């Protein structure tokens with residue numbers, strides 16, 4: 222509720238993000254030419270479905286952990302009640318990951334960083350869910366067309382997380398105050414850096430809900446054909462969030 | 465269980 226309070230919110234969010242982003246951008250850019258060879262890709266396509274789901278679920282969980290830590294350092298988050306902190310994270314941890322991951326996607330060759338190197342979606346054929354994979358690559362693609370800055374990613378991912386429309390929130394208005402302050406910080410920064418054109422091009426709020434949904438739907442199909450593998454080999458946190 | 469623990 223003041224121009225410098227807002228300029229200052231921007232820096233703290235940007236700062237929170239740099240401290241919690243898991244992979245440094247430089248490194249992800251270095252590695253772009255470290256591409257998987259055809260033999261390696263075959264190696265992956267010939268791993269069993271369940272070995273491959275388990276690997277993907279561990280990576281996702283590593284990534285989600287950084288998202289929690291981002292939440293904790295977020296100005297305002299910890300001052301909410303523990304019901305709403307949980308609600309917000311259950312809903313949006315993954316959505317945030319869906320945005321973060323575009324730093325690791327290369328639009329020139331349609332690849333994504335995974336286990337050391339870059340690969341295309343044919344890398345993940347063993348999972349048996351190519352509609353989900355290609356929705357994720359198409360999402361990453363469409364974000365890469367906005368050429369985000371890190372500051373822009375910080376501010377926007379803070380807004381994804383801090384959504385006052387989530388069902389289950391008890392202290393709903395305290396989330397609106399926090400949201401609104403972050404709406405402002407973000408919009409101010411785009412105004413300062415001449416980037417308000419990107420607003421019209423951002424994904425519909427629908428789109429992140431949809432991909433989160435496909436994920437849950439394919440999970441259930443998998444779980445139903447491999448109940449014990451989920452029970453015995455899937456990270457607890459993954460199961461907390463997605464079962 | 466898990467998320468509560470990470471938050472405290």
Ligand SMILES: CC1(C)CCC[C@](C)([C@H]2CC[C@]3(C)[C@@H]2[C@H](O)C[C@@H]2[C@@]4(C)CC[C@@H](O)C(C)(C)[C@@H]4[C@@H](O)C[C@]23C)O1
Nearest residue numbers: 244277278280281284318321322325333334335348436
């Ligand atoms: C949902 C399941 C478990 C099942 C279907 C396939 C997916 C979507 C697979 C396909 C691509 C996948 C490895 C994804 C993982 O979650 C998380 C990762 C990651 C976000 C997780 C780790 C991140 O540091 C990084 C490199 C950005 C990954 C992405 O570069 C690729 C991604 C997004 O996982």
